[PDB]
Design a protein around this ligand. Structure first.
Ligand SMILES: Cc1ccc(Nc2nc(N[C@@H]3CCOC[C@@H]3N)ncc2C(N)=O)cc1
Length: 263
């Protein structure tokens, strides 16, 4: 646990869990710049999110510093100063396609780690990818994440809150089953987002209309300027049948070979 007197918070909001604030945390002889999730049943969720983060250790996943019991419960994390990927790309339209390939490949490496560790993320979107630099992305926001049982390859949802339906695979919507393959679908949407410079997917559509469109075999179009091979990978990620859709090992390898082949 973290001592509250060693933590200082700026009061400007960076971002229903509550708010995210920037702060500084004195660690031995220095200060560390931190991002802090502040709580506005809900106590258990933050401590659950912290318990998932504590278990993960990978260069493409945000590192948690610790939790802080003070005026409210707080999850203290290493600050990713460039912020959410979607917003960055909205404000930086000059970013080159090789640079976007590099960043989504990094997300796929982090997700391959998550899949090996038998964790489902359940909220994989461009808003939950954080940029440490313009060439270094990290996955964050493990508020819906679950550690799968040793003998199971999906989490069965009981709790039916407000879901990020536009990022969810058909099996999550129709049967409430969330697997790593379900995260691969989300990853496809994240890729569409990245090459669309942070535009919202399925613009102006209700979740129910998105579900109808997908059942017809329809999918989002190729974003302007997107390499063909990356649009193709998006379509593979959006394979309707779970057994036919690739896992993250296959997805990361495809991105890795394509990225390394760029001249
Ligand atoms: C503008 C800005 C800069 C840094 C961050 N940092 C983080 N944000 C989150 N969560 C956010 C919740 C609101 O929606 C956007 C984000 N998903 N989580 C972790 C960090 C971090 N460790 O830096 C947010 C906004």
């Amino acid at each position: 646990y973290l001592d509250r007197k060693l933590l200082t918070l700026e009061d400007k909001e960076l971002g229903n869990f509550g708010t995210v604030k920037k702060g500084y945390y004195q660690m031995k002889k220095v200060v560390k710049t931190v991002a802090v999730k502040i709580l506005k049943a809900l106590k258990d969720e933050l401590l659950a999110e912290a318990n998932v983060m504590q278990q993960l250790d990978n260069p493409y996943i945000v590192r948690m510093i610790g939790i802080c019991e003070a005026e409210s419960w707080m999850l203290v994390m290493e600050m990713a100063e460039l912020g959410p990927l979607n917003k960055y790309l909205q404000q930086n339209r000059h970013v080159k396609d090789k640079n976007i390939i590099e960043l989504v490949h990094q997300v796929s490496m982090g997700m391959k780690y998550l899949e090996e560790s038998n964790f489902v993320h359940r909220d994989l979107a461009a808003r939950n990818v954080l940029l440490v630099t313009q060439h270094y992305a990290k996955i964050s926001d493990f508020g819906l994440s679950k550690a799968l049982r040793a003998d199971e390859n999906y989490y069965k949802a009981q709790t039916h809150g407000k879901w990020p339906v536009k990022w969810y695979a058909p099996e999550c919507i129709n049967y409430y089953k969330f697997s790593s393959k379900s995260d691969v679908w989300s990853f496809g949407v994240l890729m569409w987002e990245a090459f669309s410079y942070g535009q919202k997917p399925y613009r102006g559509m209700k979740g129910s209309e998105v579900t109808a469109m997908l059942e017809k075999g329809e999918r989002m179009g190729c974003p302007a300027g997107c390499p063909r091979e990356m649009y193709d990978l998006m379509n593979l990620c959006w394979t309707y049948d779970v057994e036919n859709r690739p896992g993250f090992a296959a997805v990361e390898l495809r991105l890795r070979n394509y990225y390394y082949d760029v001249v």
